[PDB]
UniProtKB/Swiss-Prot annotation, chain B:
Taxonomic lineage: Bacteria, Pseudomonadati, Pseudomonadota, Gammaproteobacteria, Pseudomonadales
Function: Represses expression from the ttgABC operon promoter and its own expression. Binds to a promoter region between the divergently transcribed ttgR and ttgABC genes/operons; in the presence of chloramphenicol or tetracycline this binding no longer occurs and ttgR and ttgABC are derepressed. This suggests that TtgR binds these antibiotics.
Entry protein name: HTH-type transcriptional regulator TtgR
Gene3D superfamilies in alphabetical order: Tetracycline Repressor, domain 2
InterPro entries to which the protein is assigned, alphabetical: DNA-bd_HTH_TetR-type_CS, Homeodomain-like_sf, HTH-type_TetR-like_transc_reg, HTH_TetR, Tet_transcr_reg_TetR-rel_C_sf, Tscrpt_reg_MAATS_C
Leader peptide range in chain numbering: none
A Pfam family annotated for this UniProt entry: TetR_N
UniProt xrefs under PROSITE patterns: HTH_TETR_1 (PS01081), HTH_TETR_2 (PS50977)
GO MF terms held by the record: DNA-binding transcription repressor activity; transcription cis-regulatory region binding
Length: 205, 206
């Protein structure tokens, strides 16, 4: 009884450590349960499987940004592209400063395989990125129907180009941090990608 | 017979690919690639010491098709080094869509290959690879610049990083949701977009 609003968050913290150390593919619920100090039944109570745990880690990333995200995906917001700028700067600040964000991103990008003996991992990822895509595409049209935004962006493609650049930059920094002074030059990195979204003719219809 | 060995390196590699693709790199070991290929046992050990070593043989095969256009791009005497960079990326994406082998080895590289302190050598290899790749995009871009094909005050290094990231995330995006990027239909649009960023971003200058 309110036994585990608490153990849920301790099970997720042990999942991160197991996954960060041994990787997702070879970690069993039992490694995690041992690490949390609970039983595999205590885990089954919150999660029906390892894919669900992975999900919980993935989903935990959207929290911090939620507001700037939602803000920028909204007409009434006087200034969409500017919330997208803030959002992006926060995304990079949080990767640099927060060990937790970084670790979960490291697990996501470099320690979580897609194999057909658990395709809910690849499935959940597809769904996550299409979700994120609809988001970027709104933010993109709202900027456009606001003069912030060369009236003929192909949105959908601008959105894909954007996610791609931010995604590959993050994974880049994760591979070689001392080669992307991400914190020091946050603004230049964020702007570079925004300059792509408006200054590039190729992203136009 | 030397020619039999060459035959059996090349079939160790073929089966590693199918092997990593279905079961992933983490839970697949040399033993299992021998049964897959139908091989002899020290054979894979003669050829391939490790697993990191075999993984690296796959990641290495990828560059082969691009050698020519990559070399020209970075040649300080080549008259159209950005044209090389352009057509190189065209061949990269063209081959990605068309060549099943390339697509699978990339899928392995991107989606079936964990970095664990448990090896080190998979991650280490990879850092080197990307640092190497980086080196070349810098020269290339630095050649396009001498020659007034890209903005004169461009930061070559930060531009090379921007470009690598875009091409890497774009490739990964397609492997994940291929029906969301007409990579083969639009190839020139995708190459073009990334290249626009290099020539038009003022944040990439100074
Ligand atoms: O909505 C987001 C958050 C961001 C992100 C979330 C988590 C993470 O680990 C890394 C990046 O990805 C993005 C990438 C973009 O191009 C545009 C965006 O609006 C976003
Ligand atoms: O030389 C290469 C190899 C290429 C590549 C892409 C995908 C892949 O799976 C393997 C290699 O990436 C590049 C990206 C560039 O901007 C410039 C380049 O010169 C290169």
């Amino acid at each position: 009884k309110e036994e585990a609003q608490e153990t849920r968050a301790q099970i997720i913290e042990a999942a991160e450590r197991a996954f960060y150390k041994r990787g997702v593919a070879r970690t069993t619920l039992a490694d995690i349960a041992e690490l949390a100090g609970v039983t595999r039944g205590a885990i089954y109570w919150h999660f029906n499987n390892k894919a669900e745990l992975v999900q919980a880690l993935l989903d935990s990333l959207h929290e911090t940004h939620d507001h700037l995200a939602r803000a920028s995906e909204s007409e009434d917001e006087v200034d969409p592209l500017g919330c997208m700028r803030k959002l992006l700067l926060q995304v990079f600040n949080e990767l640099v400063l927060d060990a937790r964000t970084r670790r979960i991103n490291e697990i996501l990008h470099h320690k979580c395989e897609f194999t057909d003996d658990m395709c809910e991992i690849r499935q959940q990822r597809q769904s996550a990125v299409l979700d994120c895509h609809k988001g970027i595409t709104l933010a993109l049209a709202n900027a456009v129907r606001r003069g912030q935004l060369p009236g003929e962006l192909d949105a959908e493609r601008a959105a894909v180009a954007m996610f791609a650049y931010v995604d590959g930059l993050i994974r880049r920094w994760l591979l070689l941090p001392d080669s992307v002074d991400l914190l020091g030059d946050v603004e230049k990195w964020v702007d570079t990608g925004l300059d792509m979204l408006r200054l590039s003719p190729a992203l136009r219809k």
